[PDB]
Coordinates of C-alpha atoms in Angstrom, one line a residue:
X146 CA 65.3 27.5 235.0
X147 CA 61.6 26.8 234.2
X148 CA 62.2 27.0 230.4
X149 CA 64.3 23.9 230.4
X150 CA 61.8 22.2 232.8
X151 CA 58.9 22.5 230.4
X152 CA 61.2 21.6 227.6
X153 CA 62.0 18.4 229.4
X154 CA 58.4 17.6 230.2
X155 CA 57.4 18.2 226.6
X156 CA 60.2 15.9 225.4
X157 CA 58.9 13.2 227.8
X158 CA 55.4 13.6 226.6
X159 CA 56.6 13.4 223.0
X160 CA 58.5 10.2 223.8
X161 CA 55.4 8.8 225.5
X162 CA 53.2 9.5 222.5
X163 CA 55.8 7.9 220.2
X164 CA 55.7 4.8 222.4
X165 CA 51.9 4.9 222.2
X166 CA 52.0 4.9 218.4
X167 CA 54.6 2.1 218.4
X168 CA 52.2 0.1 220.6
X169 CA 49.4 0.8 218.1
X170 CA 51.5 -0.4 215.2
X171 CA 52.6 -3.5 217.0
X172 CA 49.1 -4.5 218.1
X173 CA 47.8 -3.9 214.6
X174 CA 50.5 -6.1 213.2
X175 CA 49.7 -8.8 215.8
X176 CA 46.0 -8.6 215.0
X177 CA 46.7 -9.0 211.3
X178 CA 48.9 -12.0 211.9
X179 CA 46.2 -13.6 214.1
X180 CA 43.6 -13.0 211.4
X181 CA 45.8 -14.5 208.8
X182 CA 46.5 -17.6 210.9
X183 CA 42.8 -18.3 211.4
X184 CA 41.6 -16.8 208.1
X185 CA 41.0 -20.2 206.5
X186 CA 39.2 -21.7 209.6
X187 CA 35.5 -21.8 209.1
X188 CA 33.9 -21.9 212.6
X189 CA 31.4 -20.0 214.7
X190 CA 31.9 -16.2 215.1
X191 CA 32.5 -16.3 218.9
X192 CA 35.0 -19.2 218.7
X193 CA 37.3 -17.3 216.3
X194 CA 36.6 -13.9 217.8
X195 CA 37.4 -14.6 221.4
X196 CA 41.1 -14.1 220.8
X197 CA 40.4 -10.9 218.9
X198 CA 38.2 -9.6 221.8
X199 CA 41.1 -10.4 224.2
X200 CA 43.6 -8.5 222.0
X201 CA 41.2 -5.5 221.8
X202 CA 40.8 -5.5 225.5
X203 CA 44.6 -5.7 225.9
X204 CA 45.0 -2.6 223.7
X205 CA 42.1 -0.8 225.5
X206 CA 43.8 -1.3 228.9
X207 CA 47.2 -0.3 227.4
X208 CA 45.8 3.0 226.1
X209 CA 44.0 3.5 229.4
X210 CA 47.2 3.0 231.3
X211 CA 49.0 5.4 229.0
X212 CA 46.4 8.0 229.6
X213 CA 46.6 7.5 233.3
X214 CA 50.4 7.8 233.4
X215 CA 50.4 11.0 231.2
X216 CA 47.7 12.5 233.4
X217 CA 49.7 11.8 236.6
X218 CA 52.9 13.2 235.0
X219 CA 50.9 16.4 234.2
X220 CA 49.6 16.4 237.8
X221 CA 53.1 16.1 239.2
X222 CA 54.3 18.9 237.0
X223 CA 51.4 21.2 238.1
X224 CA 52.1 20.3 241.8
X225 CA 55.7 21.2 241.5
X226 CA 54.8 24.5 239.7
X227 CA 52.9 25.9 242.6
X228 CA 55.0 24.5 245.5
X229 CA 55.6 26.8 248.4
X230 CA 56.8 26.5 252.0
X231 CA 54.5 25.1 254.8
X232 CA 52.7 22.9 252.2
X233 CA 51.6 19.6 253.7
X234 CA 51.8 16.7 251.3
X235 CA 50.8 13.2 252.0
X236 CA 50.7 10.6 249.2
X237 CA 54.1 9.0 249.9
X238 CA 54.3 7.9 246.3
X239 CA 53.7 11.4 244.9
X240 CA 56.4 12.8 247.3
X241 CA 58.9 10.1 246.2

């Protein structure tokens, strides 16, 4: 049954990448809206750029979390691939 298994994991990865691109588009739109709202406000660079820095950090952590979750999905798939009897396995979360 392995064929269907890698088909399923590939489909999950494709959906994850689609969600990532949707997040990219949404954050780009939000940044554009924020820029437009404060486009006419003439103030210091940091005062107007603090919100932009926060949004960029939010996107950075979002992409880092996406990378981490895809990496753990790949790790779980690899672990199941080479699973045999008498294999000790801690990591309660991984077993669940």
